[PDB]
Design a protein around this motif. Structure first.
Motif, PDB file in Angstrom:
ATOM      1  N   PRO A  43       2.952  27.996  -3.469  1.00  0.00           N
ATOM      2  CA  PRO A  43       2.867  28.225  -4.915  1.00  0.00           C
ATOM      3  C   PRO A  43       4.088  28.897  -5.551  1.00  0.00           C
ATOM      4  CG  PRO A  43       1.390  29.672  -3.699  1.00  0.00           C
ATOM      5  CD  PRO A  43       1.818  28.608  -2.763  1.00  0.00           C
ATOM      6  N   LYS A  44       4.641  29.915  -4.897  1.00  0.00           N
ATOM      7  CA  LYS A  44       5.867  30.557  -5.368  1.00  0.00           C
ATOM      8  C   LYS A  44       7.059  29.693  -5.022  1.00  0.00           C
ATOM      9  CE  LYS A  44       5.224  34.745  -3.844  1.00  0.00           C
ATOM     10  NZ  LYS A  44       5.130  36.218  -3.649  1.00  0.00           N
ATOM     11  N   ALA A  45       7.729  29.189  -6.055  1.00  0.00           N
ATOM     12  CA  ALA A  45       8.874  28.292  -5.904  1.00  0.00           C
ATOM     13  C   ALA A  45       9.927  28.781  -4.901  1.00  0.00           C
ATOM     14  CB  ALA A  45       9.515  28.030  -7.263  1.00  0.00           C
ATOM     15  N   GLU A  46      10.251  30.074  -4.952  1.00  0.00           N
ATOM     16  CA  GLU A  46      11.298  30.673  -4.104  1.00  0.00           C
ATOM     17  C   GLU A  46      10.977  30.689  -2.607  1.00  0.00           C
ATOM     18  OE1 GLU A  46      11.205  32.692  -7.540  1.00  0.00           O
ATOM     19  OE2 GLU A  46       9.238  31.871  -6.976  1.00  0.00           O
ATOM     20  N   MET A  47       9.685  30.612  -2.272  1.00  0.00           N
ATOM     21  CA  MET A  47       9.222  30.551  -0.875  1.00  0.00           C
ATOM     22  C   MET A  47       9.523  29.207  -0.216  1.00  0.00           C
ATOM     23  SD  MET A  47       5.383  32.067  -0.992  1.00  0.00           S
ATOM     24  CE  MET A  47       5.322  33.429   0.190  1.00  0.00           C
ATOM     25  N   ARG A  48       9.575  28.151  -1.032  1.00  0.00           N
ATOM     26  CA  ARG A  48       9.771  26.783  -0.554  1.00  0.00           C
ATOM     27  C   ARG A  48      11.191  26.611  -0.019  1.00  0.00           C
ATOM     28  NH1 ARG A  48       7.794  24.706  -6.381  1.00  0.00           N
ATOM     29  NH2 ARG A  48       5.673  25.578  -6.333  1.00  0.00           N
ATOM     30  N   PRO A  49      11.386  25.675   0.925  1.00  0.00           N
ATOM     31  CA  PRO A  49      12.719  25.501   1.503  1.00  0.00           C
ATOM     32  C   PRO A  49      13.698  24.843   0.526  1.00  0.00           C
ATOM     33  CG  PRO A  49      10.994  24.396   2.810  1.00  0.00           C
ATOM     34  CD  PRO A  49      10.409  24.732   1.491  1.00  0.00           C
ATOM     35  N   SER A  50      14.989  25.052   0.756  1.00  0.00           N
ATOM     36  CA  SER A  50      16.018  24.302   0.065  1.00  0.00           C
ATOM     37  C   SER A  50      16.126  22.952   0.762  1.00  0.00           C
ATOM     38  CB  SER A  50      17.359  25.038   0.125  1.00  0.00           C
ATOM     39  OG  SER A  50      17.908  25.017   1.435  1.00  0.00           O
ATOM     40  N   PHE A  51      16.690  21.964   0.067  1.00  0.00           N
ATOM     41  CA  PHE A  51      16.907  20.646   0.664  1.00  0.00           C
ATOM     42  C   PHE A  51      17.879  20.692   1.842  1.00  0.00           C
ATOM     43  CE2 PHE A  51      14.935  18.884  -3.286  1.00  0.00           C
ATOM     44  CZ  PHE A  51      13.945  18.136  -2.662  1.00  0.00           C
ATOM     45  N   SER A  52      18.847  21.605   1.783  1.00  0.00           N
ATOM     46  CA  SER A  52      19.750  21.826   2.909  1.00  0.00           C
ATOM     47  C   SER A  52      18.993  22.330   4.141  1.00  0.00           C
ATOM     48  CB  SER A  52      20.882  22.781   2.532  1.00  0.00           C
ATOM     49  OG  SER A  52      21.732  22.174   1.574  1.00  0.00           O
ATOM     50  N   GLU A  53      18.021  23.217   3.920  1.00  0.00           N
ATOM     51  CA  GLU A  53      17.146  23.684   4.991  1.00  0.00           C
ATOM     52  C   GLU A  53      16.291  22.547   5.525  1.00  0.00           C
ATOM     53  OE1 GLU A  53      16.503  28.495   4.060  1.00  0.00           O
ATOM     54  OE2 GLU A  53      15.350  26.992   2.966  1.00  0.00           O
ATOM     55  N   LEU A  54      15.901  21.640   4.632  1.00  0.00           N
ATOM     56  CA  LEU A  54      15.080  20.491   5.002  1.00  0.00           C
ATOM     57  C   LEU A  54      15.859  19.440   5.801  1.00  0.00           C
ATOM     58  CD1 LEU A  54      12.727  20.269   1.854  1.00  0.00           C
ATOM     59  CD2 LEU A  54      12.034  20.661   4.220  1.00  0.00           C
ATOM     60  N   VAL A  55      17.090  19.136   5.376  1.00  0.00           N
ATOM     61  CA  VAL A  55      17.958  18.239   6.147  1.00  0.00           C
ATOM     62  C   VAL A  55      18.113  18.763   7.578  1.00  0.00           C
ATOM     63  CG1 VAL A  55      20.314  17.337   6.450  1.00  0.00           C
ATOM     64  CG2 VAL A  55      19.176  17.157   4.231  1.00  0.00           C
ATOM     65  N   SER A  56      18.495  20.035   7.726  1.00  0.00           N
ATOM     66  CA  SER A  56      18.682  20.633   9.049  1.00  0.00           C
ATOM     67  C   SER A  56      17.377  20.730   9.857  1.00  0.00           C
ATOM     68  CB  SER A  56      19.338  22.007   8.939  1.00  0.00           C
ATOM     69  OG  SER A  56      18.360  23.030   8.898  1.00  0.00           O
ATOM     70  N   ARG A  57      16.277  21.062   9.187  1.00  0.00           N
ATOM     71  CA  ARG A  57      14.973  21.199   9.841  1.00  0.00           C
ATOM     72  C   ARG A  57      14.415  19.846  10.305  1.00  0.00           C
ATOM     73  NH1 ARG A  57      11.792  25.365   6.825  1.00  0.00           N
ATOM     74  NH2 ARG A  57      11.661  26.783   8.634  1.00  0.00           N
ATOM     75  N   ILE A  58      14.284  18.902   9.373  1.00  0.00           N
ATOM     76  CA  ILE A  58      13.777  17.552   9.658  1.00  0.00           C
ATOM     77  C   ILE A  58      14.633  16.801  10.683  1.00  0.00           C
ATOM     78  CG2 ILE A  58      13.482  15.248   8.650  1.00  0.00           C
ATOM     79  CD1 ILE A  58      12.394  16.796   6.113  1.00  0.00           C
ATOM     80  N   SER A  59      15.951  16.957  10.585  1.00  0.00           N
ATOM     81  CA  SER A  59      16.887  16.366  11.543  1.00  0.00           C
ATOM     82  C   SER A  59      16.587  16.783  12.988  1.00  0.00           C
ATOM     83  CB  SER A  59      18.325  16.729  11.178  1.00  0.00           C
ATOM     84  OG  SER A  59      19.197  16.436  12.250  1.00  0.00           O
TER      85      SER A  59
END
Ligand SMILES: COc1cc2c(Oc3ccc(-c4cnc(Cc5ccccc5)n(C)c4=O)cc3F)ccnc2cc1OCCCN1CCOCC1
Length: 268
Positions: free
Chosen positions: A239-255
């Motif tokens: 719910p809190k926007a700031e808690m959600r990952p950045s897309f850069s975090e997502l690229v590195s995480r999902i990869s």
């Protein structure tokens, strides 16, 4: 009759119709035709052409043009390029885009003839992430991220292009759209991939969605979805926007998850 300085700023996005043919009888969103564009070096290229029939006045055309100026600046493998726009003297304007062999990602994953593996679907999710990473880096908010809005070319490269069931909490209550609200929608996009195009929240109406989320109820884990990737989804849905990952975090995480998998039917 648009503003002269605005017309000058747009010239690099405009296609002189003398170099475009639109096969109005060959339909592919929904008003999309086969086209042939002739580029400045002499290159004949095959495109999809959409007619923006909802345009009318100077304001809309102005909005449209500056939108085009923005989209035209974007160069990334995972973002659909604008090839140009066409301002016809006796007809609503045209967006010209590179032809995408395999159409949009939702249709491609939904049809039973195709058989993408878990690695394939994560791969498609990863590429979206890369394009979104780039868009965010350019301080561009997408607002309309969904499987249906991602294109898929002959090399099986996913292109991002442009919905309450995809919207973030704070957007549903405050119509506030940020890159962090794009993250929420990317989480839904991921669920879409790992379900192979299932409709999200089937048994909840478009108006009862906000109270659904305020209860804490989230999209259930998809059949094809690996546990580490489901945890990625839920981070995207805090719910809190700031808690959600950045897309850069997502690229590195999902990869990292993607690399643990073997078996691809659609490579590159
Ligand atoms: C309908 O399916 C396709 C759609 C395609 C396509 O669609 C579009 C995507 C994005 C946009 C678009 C992009 N951006 C904007 C913002 C914008 C605002 C202002 C100025 C410039 C831009 N707007 C407003 C837009 O409309 C428009 C489009 F027409 C583009 C390229 N190739 C496509 C190829 C397709 O199908 C391939 C064949 C699939 N077969 C396979 C066997 O199964 C049956 C069918």
């Amino acid at each position: 009759a648009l503003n002269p300085e605005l017309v000058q700023a747009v010239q690099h996005v405009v296609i002189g119709p003398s170099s475009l043919i639109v096969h109005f009888n060959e339909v592919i969103f929904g008003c999309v035709y086969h086209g042939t564009l002739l580029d400045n070096d002499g290159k004949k290229i095959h495109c999809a052409v959409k007619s923006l029939n909802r345009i009318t006045d100077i304001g809309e055309v102005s909005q449209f043009l500056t939108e085009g100026i923005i989209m035209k600046d974007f160069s990334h493998p995972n973002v659909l390029s604008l090839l140009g726009i066409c301002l016809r003297s006796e007809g609503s304007p045209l967006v010209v885009l590179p032809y995408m062999k395999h159409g949009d990602l939702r249709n491609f994953i939904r049809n039973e003839t195709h058989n993408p593996t878990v690695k394939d679907l994560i791969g498609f999710g990863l590429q979206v992430a890369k394009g979104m990473k780039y868009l965010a880096s350019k301080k561009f908010v997408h607002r309309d991220l969904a499987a249906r809005n991602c294109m898929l070319d002959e090399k099986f490269t996913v292109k991002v292009a442009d919905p309450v069931k995809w919207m973030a909490l704070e957007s549903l209550q405050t119509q506030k759209f940020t890159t962090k609200s794009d993250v929420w929608s990317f989480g839904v996009l991921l669920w879409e991939l790992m379900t192979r195009g299932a409709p999200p929240y089937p048994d909840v109406n478009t108006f009862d969605i906000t109270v659904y989320l305020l209860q804490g109820r989230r999209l259930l884990q998809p059949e094809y979805c690996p546990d580490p990737l489901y945890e990625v989804m839920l981070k995207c849905w805090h719910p809190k926007a700031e808690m959600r990952p950045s897309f850069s975090e997502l690229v590195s995480r999902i990869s990292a998850i993607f690399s643990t998998f073997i078996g691809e039917h659609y490579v590159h």
